[PDB]
Structure 1
Amino acid sequence: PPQPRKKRPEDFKFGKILGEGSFSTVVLARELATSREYAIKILEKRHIIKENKVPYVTRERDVMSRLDHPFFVKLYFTFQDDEKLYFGLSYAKNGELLKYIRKIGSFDETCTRFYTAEIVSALEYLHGKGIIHRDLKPENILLNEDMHIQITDFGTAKVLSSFVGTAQYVSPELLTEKSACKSSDLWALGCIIYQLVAGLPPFRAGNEYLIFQKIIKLEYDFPEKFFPKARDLVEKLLVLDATKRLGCEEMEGYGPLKAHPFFESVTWENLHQQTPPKL
C-alpha cells in the first residue's frame, strides 16, 4: 500500500517545549502544508545508543503504532535526520490531568466518576491488547481540546509474550518480586481514583524509601469527605495480593469492575461521545 512520503524537520515550524522524558524532549510543532499541531517527541540517537535505550525506544514506537483508541495518544509519523529521531504524536491542548487536580483542588463525584470511567475504558482497551502501561499517572493522562483523556508515555510499557515507575504509583509486587502485569495498572488506577477525590496520592512520605515502606504495609487512610462508593472501589484496587484486585483475570476481568456500584449511572459503550462534566 503506497503510504505518503517521509516527513522531515523543514516541513514543521517548531515551537514551545511541551515536556521532557528520560532520553527525550516533546516539542509543539505546526505542519506547514496543513496547519496541524503535533507534539513531536525528539530523541537523540547518540544518547539512546550510549545509555542502551534502543530496546526502550523500539518497544515505545511499536506499542504506539498498535494503539487505535480515542483515549490514547496517536503516533501519526516518525522520521529521522542524522542526529535525531522524531515521533509525531497527537497534541493534547488542555495538558495533563495533574494540572487540573492542582487547579480545581479535588474533583466532585460526577467528574471523578467520568474521568475514572474513561481511565477504566482505556485500560480495558490496552489490556485487551496485551499491553501494560507500567508507569501510569496523572502526568501521563492528558486532556484533549474537548476535555476527553489521551493517555501517553509508552516508553516504560510492556507487551505480553524489569523496570520500576513513579514511586507514588508503584504496586507492592513490583517492590518485592521485581515483577508486573495488568494488576500493576489497576493498582495505579486505585491511586488515581484516590487523588481525584482527595486532591493528593494515597501514599506520601519524605523520600522514595519511606513511600515504598508505606506501600508494602498498605499504610494509607481515607479523609472524612471521601465518597463511600469511590472509597469502596479504591479498597478493591489497593489490595496487596495482586490476584485479588477488582478488574484482573483471576477476579474475572473488566466486567465486575465496570459493574462496581460507583459506576451505576455510567454508559460504558460510548464515553468518547459523552460531553465531559465541567471542572
Structure 2
Amino acid sequence: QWALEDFEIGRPLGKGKFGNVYLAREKQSKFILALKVLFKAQLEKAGVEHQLRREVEIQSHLRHPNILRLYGYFHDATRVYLILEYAPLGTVYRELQKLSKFDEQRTATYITELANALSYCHSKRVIHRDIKPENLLLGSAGELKIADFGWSVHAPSSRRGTLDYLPPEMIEGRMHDEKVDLWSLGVLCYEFLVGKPPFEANTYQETYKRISRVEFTFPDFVTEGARDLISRLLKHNPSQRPMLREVLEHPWITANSS
C-alpha cells in the first residue's frame, strides 16, 4: 500500500538499535510523522524479525492518548519502515538531561499518564517490557506517550542496552507477566525525582547484583510519600507489587498530580 516514494524525508529524530528514525511528510496529505527504518540484514543477523512482527501487531491495535500511534508499515528489498505518530517535544530522556531532576508535580503527572497507558495495555494482556525515558515521548501539549513496542509481548511470557529498568524475574530469564511494568514504573519515579535510576552502575554486572538484591538508597530530599510509592513498586516478588489502580489512588500521586 505505502512505499518510500510517498514520503519526503527530513532530519533524523534518533538512532535506533536496527536503523534510524526520521522525521517525514506524506506527499499527498502533508501529514508529518516519524518513519522508523530498520535494516533487514541487521534484523536477520540478530534473529529478531519475529519480534518486529510482534511490535507492529501489538502497537497497531493500541488506541490511547498516552500511547504512541502506529499508522501502518511497509518494506522494500533492504528495509522495514514503521509509520509512527510524530512526538514533537522529544523524549523524557532529553528533558531529564537538561532539567537534571523533575519536581514532584511533573513526576506525579508523568506517573499518572504512564499508569493510565499501562492500565490499557495490561487490559489486553500486553507487557511493554522496555519502559525507559528514551522510549517515553512528548506530545504537542507536553503529554507523555509510551513508545517503542520493540520488546512488547502478551503475558505470561518466558521470552528472553542497560539492565537499569528490568525487574529481577526478566533478568535471570524467568517467567513473567504485567508486573514487570509496575517495577519499571518504580524505577522511573525514582529516576524522575533523583536524576538517575536506582540501580545505576558502571557495569552491567554491578547493576544485575543491585536489581537481584533490590539494593538502593534515597537521597535525603526524597519525600516520605515518594519513598512509599517507590518502595511499594520495587518488590523482588512480582505478586507483592501493587495494581495500577492502587498507583493512581496513592496519596502522593493524588496530592501532586496533575
TM-score (norm 1): 0.86
Task: Please say which of residues 78-87 and 97-106 is displaced more in the overlay.
Answer: 78-87
Give the conservation status (yes or no) of the 8 Å contact 1:95–1:143. Answer: yes
Structure 1 position 262 matched with structure 2 position 258: no
How far did residue 265 of structure 1 move? 4.2
Which residue of 205, 210, 215 maps to 2:206? 210
2:146 and 2:54 map into 1 onto residues whose CA distance is: 16
How far did residue 216 of structure 1 move? 1.1
Q: What are the Cα deviations for residues 24-60 of structure 1, in whole angstroms up to 9, with x where unaligned?
A: 3211111122222111111223333343222111111
Matching residue of 1:67? 62
Structure 1 position 21 matched with structure 2 position 36: no
2:152 and 2:2 map into 1 onto residues whose CA distance is: 26
Which residue of 131, 135, 138 maps to 2:130? 135
Amino acid at match of 2:48: K
Give the conservation status (yes or no) of the 8 Å contact 1:246–1:257. Answer: yes
How far did residue 164 of structure 1 move? 5.8
Matching residue of 2:92? 97
Structure 1 position 44 matched with structure 2 position 34: no
Amino acid at match of 1:202: P
Structure 1: gaps spanning 5 or more residues: 1-5, 248-253, 268-275
How far did residue 259 of structure 1 move? 1.5
Give the conservation status (yes or no) of the 8 Å contact 2:162–2:204. Answer: no
Matching residue of 1:156? 151
Structure 1 position 223 matched with structure 2 position 213: no
How far did residue 96 of structure 1 move? 0.6
1:152 and 1:187 map into 2 onto residues whose CA distance is: 18
Structure 2: gaps spanning 5 or more residues: none
Give the conservation status (yes or no) of the 8 Å contact 2:160–2:173. Answer: no
The structure-2 alpha-carbon separation of the partners of 1:188 and 1:100, relative to structure 1 and needing over 3 Å to count, comes to same
How far did residue 264 of structure 1 move? 2.2
Amino acid at match of 2:248: K
Matching residue of 1:123? 118
1:167 and 1:46 map into 2 onto residues whose CA distance is: 26
2:208 and 2:45 map into 1 onto residues whose CA distance is: 30
Give the conservation status (yes or no) of the 8 Å contact 1:140–1:151. Answer: yes
2:252 and 2:25 map into 1 onto residues whose CA distance is: 41
Amino acid at match of 1:36: F
The structure-2 alpha-carbon separation of the partners of 1:46 and 1:177, relative to structure 1 and needing over 3 Å to count, comes to closer
How far did residue 130 of structure 1 move? 0.7
2:179 and 2:95 map into 1 onto residues whose CA distance is: 26
Matching residue of 2:7? 12
> Percent of aligned pairs with the same residue?
35
SS in structure 1 at match of 2:180: helix
* C-alpha RMSD of the superposition: 1.8
The structure-2 alpha-carbon separation of the partners of 1:177 and 1:54, relative to structure 1 and needing over 3 Å to count, comes to closer
The structure-2 alpha-carbon separation of the partners of 1:243 and 1:198, relative to structure 1 and needing over 3 Å to count, comes to same
Q: What are the Cα deviations for residues 183-221 of structure 1, in whole angstroms up to 9, with x where unaligned?
A: 111111100000111111111222000011111111110
Give the conservation status (yes or no) of the 8 Å contact 2:168–2:212. Answer: yes
Give the conservation status (yes or no) of the 8 Å contact 1:109–1:227. Answer: no
Which residue of 83, 93, 112 maps to 2:78? 83
2:216 and 2:176 map into 1 onto residues whose CA distance is: 22
1:42 and 1:175 map into 2 onto residues whose CA distance is: 28
Amino acid at match of 1:209: Q
How far did residue 227 of structure 1 move? 2.1
How far did residue 266 of structure 1 move? 7.2
